[PDB]
Amino acid sequence: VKKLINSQISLLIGKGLHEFDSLRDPEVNDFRTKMRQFCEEAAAHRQQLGWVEWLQYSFPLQLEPNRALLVNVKFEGSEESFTFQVSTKDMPLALMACALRKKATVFRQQPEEYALQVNGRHEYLYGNYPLCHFQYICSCLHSGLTPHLTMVHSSSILAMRDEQSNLWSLEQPFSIELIEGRKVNAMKLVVQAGLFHGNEMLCKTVSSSEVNVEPVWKQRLEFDISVCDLPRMARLCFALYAVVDCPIAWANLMLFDYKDQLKTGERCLYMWPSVLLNPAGTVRGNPNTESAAALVIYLPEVAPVYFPALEKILELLREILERELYEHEKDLVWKMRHEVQEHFPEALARLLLVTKWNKHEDVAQMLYLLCSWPELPVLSALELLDFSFPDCYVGSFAIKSLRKLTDDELFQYLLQLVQVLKYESYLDCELTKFLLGRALANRKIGHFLFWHLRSEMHVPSVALRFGLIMEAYCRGSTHHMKVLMKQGEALSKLKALNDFVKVSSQKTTKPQTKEMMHMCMRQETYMEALSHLQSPLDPSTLLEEVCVEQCTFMDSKMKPLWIMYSSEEAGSAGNVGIIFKNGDDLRQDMLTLQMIQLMDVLWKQEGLDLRMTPYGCLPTGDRTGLIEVVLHSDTIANIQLNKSNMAATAAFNKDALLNWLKSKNPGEALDRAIEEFTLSCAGYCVATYVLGIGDRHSDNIMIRESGQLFHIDFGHFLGNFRVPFILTYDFVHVIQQGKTNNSEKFERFRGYCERAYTILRRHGLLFLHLFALMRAAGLPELSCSKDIQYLKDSLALGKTEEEALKHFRVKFNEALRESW
Numbered sequence: 001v002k003k004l005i006n007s008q009i010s011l012l013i014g015k016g017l018h019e020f021d022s023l024r025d026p027e028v029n030d031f032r033t034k035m036r037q038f039c040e041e042a043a044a045h046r047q048q049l050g051w052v053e054w055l056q057y058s059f060p061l062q063l064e065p066n067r068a069l070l071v072n073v074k075f076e077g078s079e080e081s082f083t084f085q086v087s088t089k090d091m092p093l094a095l096m097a098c099a100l101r102k103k104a105t106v107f108r109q110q111p112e113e114y115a116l117q118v119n120g121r122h123e124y125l126y127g128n129y130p131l132c133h134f135q136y137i138c139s140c141l142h143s144g145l146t147p148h149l150t151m152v153h154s155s156s157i158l159a160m161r162d163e164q165s166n167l168w169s170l171e172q173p174f175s176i177e178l179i180e181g182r183k184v185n186a187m188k189l190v191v192q193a194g195l196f197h198g199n200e201m202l203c204k205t206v207s208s209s210e211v212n213v214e215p216v217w218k219q220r221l222e223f224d225i226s227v228c229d230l231p232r233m234a235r236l237c238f239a240l241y242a243v244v245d246c247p248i249a250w251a252n253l254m255l256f257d258y259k260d261q262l263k264t265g266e267r268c269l270y271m272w273p274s275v276l277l278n279p280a281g282t283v284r285g286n287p288n289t290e291s292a293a294a295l296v297i298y299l300p301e302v303a304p305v306y307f308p309a310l311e312k313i314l315e316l317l318r319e320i321l322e323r324e325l326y327e328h329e330k331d332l333v334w335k336m337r338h339e340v341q342e343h344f345p346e347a348l349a350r351l352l353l354v355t356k357w358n359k360h361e362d363v364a365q366m367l368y369l370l371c372s373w374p375e376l377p378v379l380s381a382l383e384l385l386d387f388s389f390p391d392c393y394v395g396s397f398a399i400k401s402l403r404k405l406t407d408d409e410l411f412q413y414l415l416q417l418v419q420v421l422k423y424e425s426y427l428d429c430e431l432t433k434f435l436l437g438r439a440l441a442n443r444k445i446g447h448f449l450f451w452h453l454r455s456e457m458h459v460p461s462v463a464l465r466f467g468l469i470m471e472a473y474c475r476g477s478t479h480h481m482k483v484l485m486k487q488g489e490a491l492s493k494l495k496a497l498n499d500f501v502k503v504s505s506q507k508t509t510k511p512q513t514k515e516m517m518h519m520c521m522r523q524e525t526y527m528e529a530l531s532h533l534q535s536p537l538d539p540s541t542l543l544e545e546v547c548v549e550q551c552t553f554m555d556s557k558m559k560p561l562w563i564m565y566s567s568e569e570a571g572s573a574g575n576v577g578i579i580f581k582n583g584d585d586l587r588q589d590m591l592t593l594q595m596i597q598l599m600d601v602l603w604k605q606e607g608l609d610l611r612m613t614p615y616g617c618l619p620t621g622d623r624t625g626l627i628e629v630v631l632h633s634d635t636i637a638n639i640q641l642n643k644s645n646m647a648a649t650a651a652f653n654k655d656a657l658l659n660w661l662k663s664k665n666p667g668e669a670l671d672r673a674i675e676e677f678t679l680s681c682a683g684y685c686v687a688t689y690v691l692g693i694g695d696r697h698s699d700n701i702m703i704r705e706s707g708q709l710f711h712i713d714f715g716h717f718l719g720n721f722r723v724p725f726i727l728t729y730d731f732v733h734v735i736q737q738g739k740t741n742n743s744e745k746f747e748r749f750r751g752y753c754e755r756a757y758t759i760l761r762r763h764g765l766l767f768l769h770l771f772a773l774m775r776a777a778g779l780p781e782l783s784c785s786k787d788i789q790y791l792k793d794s795l796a797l798g799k800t801e802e803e804a805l806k807h808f809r810v811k812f813n814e815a816l817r818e819s820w
């Protein structure tokens, strides 16, 4: 069984477990045993949890960031159901007693022993929250559909839990010997070396002597820094380039190992190719030893010297600026550091930036303040996870302040926290143990941590780190490994089906490709792999029987698949679709959609519901991923074709959109449809302007039958093609209820745009911190400070609320002038 689990982990993570052992790396070996021990303890705690505590793990509550409603309730082993009239203010327990009292009269004879399952979903309704606070009830209330629930007894949940079982003395200046290389280029060869502490240099960069294009240097490179003054997280960086500039390769290493021991002596650096020095770049060598440009260096023996333990470390106008600073101002913050600890604890980041990291006495003074520093709010701690703060004690403190994150906040910031892993110097770190610990305690967290790691396994710079964490997670949850394998087997089938479709679309017509896609899908191996799985887009969503006749593909470049599903146990809530796309990098789309979803959350918290469509987008592999289908939706371009023999047929093109909404929302329903349109139109106008989303045409703008407008295919953001505010006449027309002049409706829309924008301005620092953490991903449109500047300008964060509002009204007016 121990061998079968090992072979299943290897197929799941995409890398054989034997390859980790073939490295013989003591750091990899220590990480593997420690994290396995950590994850098995987590697994042991889980198998003994209470049935309510198991529901919290397995099905964490989906809550929103008086009025009467009908609710259908049945029992597990019964087709019989009772429709009850309840209130939005009523609690699950009250509904459960109604269900048990109705069963008492039917069967002729405790709600504390039950939970409510959402029919055909891995979602439950429980705890002291009124029905309207559950995301599922909210969806039901807005759509006008009846919530369907199942009374699940505590014994049936226990049965699920059960079936799911498993030093200062060295004053000499730091120096290295540069022995030789073994590369390929056209000219002379120079090795530029630098000592860095994050983005900041610990001294000036020291260049090599020019050698003609196996180059041998055998030269001594000396740095303007003493050996005692090197911080624990000191990073030695190298860049190889050609001179007549021409970058070739780059390589980095930590001066201290994973056991705090200063490194000696000879080292071979397997360099990485270039697009001069790259401090943010990984500290592990290129695994392609065959075709990698190498560099041999000698680290002189200063003798065994370790980095001092914390016990040894511990022994050894101010307000007008504190909201980039001058040399005198830095000295002001440094001298008054005890007053920063006492009266301004949230100004920790500015204090860490003014400390001389190249001086061990300033670091020991800094760290002494840190070990007695009060816990910072979650917003402050996210700023400290940035590569601008590379110290291990600073990182350990940042995680300590992030422990108070709820599972919903951590789900919100999960993507950024996974990208911080790419900045880590060692395998065994506090962020990994925190992420692993929160993943093992929350099945939905576990789910997305797996997929964020798995989607990057084709990248060699992270393949070892990500594969080790995933193996660690699998030791902690054998059942979820099996669940995740069913997902990967479906994606393996979708990839092969998409490949046939890509080839077929160029040889024959769509009717013949679709019919031959269906026959391929109808094969037993396909029918088995594509059916009865949890959605990678959302674990609470169950993809039951694949609806072959309803499956197709889209006509865009990559020929993406349209896969439909149906469930008897869920009814109409089980009618779901997934889009499979292979050939495009989906990382940027996922980031864009996460940011919009965050905006929606922030607006909802201030009571502003702009009726957004935050549909799922998940990378799953190399240029592979899934998109959640938003049912009953069509593109503006498709509506605007103004096709004949339709109810949406218009006398003027400007009217097609309104007639379509009129056809989908007859009589009294059109008023709500216009309202949904205006609200969502205000949210997406603010979302695109803030995020610099350009190249917006009728083909990448969609509409739901409800009126809800949404955006698709986000390949560009943060101005990268300054995008102006955009207003379309066709949408102004629907807002103005079709009427030529309707200032009442238009300025009510302008009001919504202003409200949406000022709320996001108040959380502008949260966007700035998350986008800075996102720089670690390596996105081409999120590489430098000029991309981050774009958000400072769009949100006008350097202004007062009054000055920023006049400026937004300037951009909104300029956009109205552009509209015809």
Ligand SMILES: Cn1nc(-c2cnc(N)c(-c3cn[nH]c3)n2)nc1C1(c2ccccc2)CC1
Residues within 6 Å of the ligand: 552, 553, 554, 555, 562, 579, 615, 627, 628, 629, 630, 631, 633, 634, 635, 638, 712, 713
């Ligand atoms: C009916 N329908 N629905 C959608 C839809 C729904 N939900 C989504 N999330 C997205 C999405 C697209 N990109 N990214 C997300 N597209 N797209 C269609 C169309 C279509 C589908 C299938 C075959 C032909 C044509 C173009 C008309």
